[PDB]
A paper describes a structure:
Coat protein 1 ([name]) coated vesicles function in retrograde trafficking between the Golgi apparatus and the Endoplasmic Reticulum (ER), and between the Golgi cisternae in both retrograde and anterograde directions. Coatomer (the [name] complex) is a heteroheptameric protein complex, consisting of α, β, β’, γ, δ, ε and ζ subunits. [name]-GTP recruits the protein complex coatomer from the cytoplasm and anchors it at the membrane. Polymerization of coatomer at the membrane assembles the [name] coat, which recruits cargo molecules and membrane machinery to the assembly site.
To further investigate the regulation of [name] in the coat, we incubated [name] coated vesicles with ArfGAP1 or [name] in the presence of a non-hydrolysable GTP analogue and determined their structures. We were unable to identify any ArfGAP1 bound to vesicles produced in the presence of GTPγS, while in vesicles incubated with [name] we identified an additional density near the central γ[name] molecules in a subset of [name] leaves. No significant additional density was observed near the peripheral β[name] molecules or at any other position in the structure. The size and shape of the additional mass corresponded very well to the catalytic domain of the [name] protein, which we fitted into the density. In this structure, the catalytic domain of [name] is positioned directly near the [name] nucleotide-site, where it can provide the Arginine ‘finger’ essential for stimulation of GTP-hydrolysis. The [name] catalytic domain is bound into a niche in the assembled coat formed by [name], the γ- and β-COP adaptor subunits, and the β’-COP outer-coat subunit. Within a triad, an [name]-binding niche is formed by β’-COP and β-COP from one leaf and by γ-COP from a neighboring leaf, with the central γ[name] molecules at the bottom. Thus, the complete binding site for the [name] catalytic domain is formed when the coat is assembled. This suggests a possible proofreading mechanism: [name] recruitment, and the resulting GTP-hydrolysis and coat dissociation can only occur once the coat is assembled, minimizing premature dissociation of coatomer from the membrane. We were not able to resolve the C-terminal, non-catalytic part of [name], known to be involved in coatomer binding via interactions with the γ-COP appendage domain, most likely because the non-catalytic part of the [name] protein is largely disordered and may not form a globular domain that can be positioned at 12 Å resolution.
Residue numbers in the entry:
A (entry chain A): 703 to 813
B (entry chain C): 605 to 843
Write the structure that this text describes.
């Protein structure tokens, strides 16, 4: 259903749902909320699952917020030292600008 | 004193004693004696000469090694390499978690290739999307027989495949006759497609967009570029 909601070009319903299944635990699923979005709040939770400031940085940096991820990372006694490619490079783009719909509701006919 | 003896011990001996050494907790030293690929390997896990462990791996000769190792590498946060091993493993799932977290297209192409590999429909889609590629998502659907669903995407974010696709879906339906089951129209009648005139296509927004895809949305960030995708987005998008 969530998928239907993201298919369609509108934003909330998925988010409450996201709340209500985030709230029902998770280790690989948060992902669903993030892409079609920019911003995620999941990160507040996420760090707790990870909490190695690593995820928090990778995620963090672009809202102009790499920084908190570093603060903890330091506090720990950091453990990061090498990284692989991953520089945001894939397009979270597509959906439905004016003319030629969405489909909340879909019309048809027996004919 | 022992060292003089040491020449005068070989293969297997080294192993036993190595275990003793290991018991001594003279792991490094235990490493020096080290004498079985397994033996070396486990110790290596404990030990973490990372590169060194790789050489022992050499050609690992078991993804299981890589899997085990991957967890370890990741712990050491020796990712550049980890990626190489994991990639070498091509063990997609864990590897995805990293790759995604910083984000990356390149990973995505190779992966796309992978995506094709995996054998359940769903992941591959996220990828296609993730990349931004309706086209890919839709092509994927063609193989799986996702047909109702494919239509929704084709509609929402318009590649107007809704017209193309709908005919085919309908055809299936058609096969399974009954007029209601057949179901029919694209520009006008049942559907009024382009005559409805509403929210998944056009040039101007699109032009702005054309660029948009190219820059980073911005708010304040890192070398790891911007795109956003929230309230603002909705507003311009309408424009």
């Amino acid at each position: 259903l969530s998928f239907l909601y993201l298919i369609t070009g509108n934003l909330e319903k998925l988010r409450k749902m996201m709340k209500i299944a985030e709230i029902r635990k998770d280790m690989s699923g948060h992902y669903q909320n993030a892409l079609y979005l920019g911003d995620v709040s999941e990160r507040v939770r996420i760090l707790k699952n990870c909490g190695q400031k690593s995820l928090a940085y990778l995620s963090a940096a672009t809202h102009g917020l790499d920084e908190e991820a570093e603060s903890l990372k330091e506090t720990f006694d950091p453990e990061k030292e090498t990284i692989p490619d991953i520089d945001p490079n894939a397009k979270l783009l597509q959906p439905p600008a004016p003319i030629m719909p969405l489909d909340t509701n879909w019309p048809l006919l027996t004919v | 004193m022992a060292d003089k003896v040491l020449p005068t011990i070989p293969k297997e001996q080294r192993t036993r004693v190595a275990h003793f050494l290991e018991k001594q907790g003279f792991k490094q030293q235990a490493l020096t004696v080290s004498t079985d690929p397994e033996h070396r390997f486990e110790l290596a896990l404990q030990l973490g000469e990372l590169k060194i462990a790789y050489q022992l791996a050499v050609e690992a000769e078991s993804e299981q090694k890589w899997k085990q190792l991957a967890e370890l590498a990741i712990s050491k946060c020796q990712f550049s390499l980890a990626q190489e091993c994991l990639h070498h493993a091509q063990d997609y799932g864990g590897l995805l978690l990293l790759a995604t977290a910083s984000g990356n297209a390149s990973m995505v192409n190779k992966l796309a290739e992978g995506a094709e590999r995996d054998g359940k429909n769903n992941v591959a889609f996220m990828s296609y999307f993730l990349q931004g590629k309706l086209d890919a998502c839709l092509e994927l659907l063609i193989r799986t027989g996702r047909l109702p669903e494919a239509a929704f995407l084709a509609r929402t974010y318009l590649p107007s495949q809704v017209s193309r696709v709908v005919k085919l879906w309908r055809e299936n339906l058609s096969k399974v006759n009954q007029k209601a089951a057949e179901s029919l129209a694209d520009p006008t009648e049942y559907e009024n497609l382009f005559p409805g005139l509403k929210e998944a296509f056009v040039v101007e927004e699109w032009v702005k967009e054309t660029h948009a895809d190219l820059w980073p949305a911005k708010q304040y960030p890192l070398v790891t570029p911007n795109e956003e995708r929230n309230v603002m987005e909705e507003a311009k998008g309408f424009q």
